């Protein structure tokens, strides 16, 4: 399911080495480290991200689109 | 078209540069105050050039007056130099498409790249000194030059004259810094690493500034401008975005936090993977 | 291509 | 074969840690970890890439890609 | 607690492979290597960062940080 | 030997995980994992790179590269 | 001690797994891979770096460096 679609409103590196993003007013986190630079880049360049997951908590699938 | 650059005084020098810019370029709508702007070179067909007669090396004196520079109009490159006493055009190897009527064209083995010129000249641009005195020495070297292969002294002369003509046309910063050397004090202008970086980033700057709409800043690789006065104080003439306009990709800019970034600069620091994985994956 | 003068 | 040449239309990080790009209307996935940020930077700047693979149908995998200056 | 919020005034790689940032006049260091390039990107782009820690004395460590645009 | 000095005309991620750049008309590959983002950054910004290797024929490998601003 | 402060004039990766930068006319090297993307990003964005070391001999190693936007 497409859990959230939009711009990253903020990102956060967490003490447990996960990474949180807020998208369309909802917070989601991922434990996949390579998503940390990918998400921060999307946030900086204004990409639309689509957080995807079987339960929309944690995610490990996300689509990146230029604005 | 023919223009004079008169080195007699700071007034005559800046007046000369301004006149050239007015004729060959058009102000950007969004980077213009009075008649002081960042301008875009007007389109001319490939191979079009203008001539620059060098005057006023000896303040207000009709001497040292046989040097002319041939400048390709679309990119402001110096294609070579003319000794008008011998009616001879010494043309760099990368400008065989530039045809000047009425002169004897000497096609040179030397190309005009700064890499080549600095090598042959045994002179790096960063820290290069230019004074009225060394412009006179440069003039004499160029009028003594003969043959198809640039000598050390001719290459030093071209480095100095290109800086104070074409690079000053491009960059008001270089115009402002160099022009102090023309005063009665006769100080030395020293080309700075920042000056050099500006000249190396001219194409990139040219691709970015047409997109400026009053953002708080502009970032193009190593170049940063924090306000319109910084832009205008630094840049005067840009390419019409020419191959130098594009490195890779097709996105001139990204606006990030009210700063206009060259997109390739942002891309070049946003292409790192996870640091722990990078450093341990040896 | 390197910067031309 | 050279399967697709053009700009990246979207990219996607996948739950199996592979990474998908859509090029010339077709989707391709790679398990090469190091390609993830390289492809995303190509995407954000509009860099043309050439995807190279044994099969070129959308949904094919790749392990080889050329970053062009077009 | 939110120890400091603002732009990164400087960053510094340290000989023990930790990484220091100065935010709102206070310095904090992290041993999380993953944060080094992310904090550099934030610093370069003028991101507003919020350092979060249970110890907020300058010179203290951190491993939680929020990144905001303007 | 100084094999090539110029801008990166294209880069390629190879099936064996090495990384190829084309500089001054010749192709050079490197297995050095640290160089992949650095070489792409050079390509993106049109940096002049100097490839040094014991052989300079197109298709030679390298591990030594200088990144220049001019 | 502050060995050198300035923009990075060039960087270079050597066959012997050292990474050289030239700052304010002086060359220093580091074998911390963490520092390669940090230093190259500093180079391509024009940050002012401050190389720091206990001893600032020419050609010596370093693993402390401050990064400033200006």
Numbering used by the authors:
A (entry chain B): 1 to 56, 60 to 70
B (entry chain A): 1 to 241, 257 to 297
C (entry chain G): 6 to 10
D (entry chain C), E (entry chain F), F (entry chain D), G (entry chain E): 1 to 70
Q: Which text from the study accompanies this structure?
A:
Shiga toxin (Stx), a major virulence factor of enterohemorrhagic Escherichia coli (EHEC), can cause fatal systemic complications. All Stx proteins consist of a catalytic A-subunit and a B-subunit pentamer. The catalytic A-subunit, which is a member of ribosome-inactivating proteins (RIPs), has an RNA N-glycosidase activity that cleaves a specific adenine from 28S ribosomal RNA to inhibit eukaryotic protein synthesis. The B-subunit pentamer functions to bind Galα–Galβ–Glcβ-ceramide (Gb3), a glycolipid present on the surface of target cells.
To elucidate the precise manner by which these shorter peptides bind to Stx2a, X-ray crystallography analysis was performed with co-crystals of each peptide and the Stx2a holotoxin, which were obtained via the soaking method. In addition, Arg6 and Arg7 of both AR4A-mono and R4A-mono electrostatically interact, respectively, with Asp94 of the A-subunit and Asp70 of the B-subunit, which is adjacent to the catalytic cavity. Overall, we find that the binding patterns of these shorter peptides are almost identical to that of MMβA-mono. We found that R4-mono, AR4A-mono, R4A-mono, and R3-mono exhibit greater inhibitory effects (relative IC50 values = 0.387, 2.27, 2.70, and 3.68 µM, respectively) than non-tagged MMβA-mono (relative IC50 = 8.14 µM), which was used as a positive control to compete the binding. Although the precise mechanism of the detrimental effect of the C-terminal Ala is remained to be elucidated, the presence of the amide group of the C-terminal Ala may contribute to fix the binding manner of the peptides with this Ala, such as MMbA-mono, AR4A-mono, R4A-mono, R3A-mono, and R2A-mono, to the same orientations which are clearly demonstrated in their crystal structures.
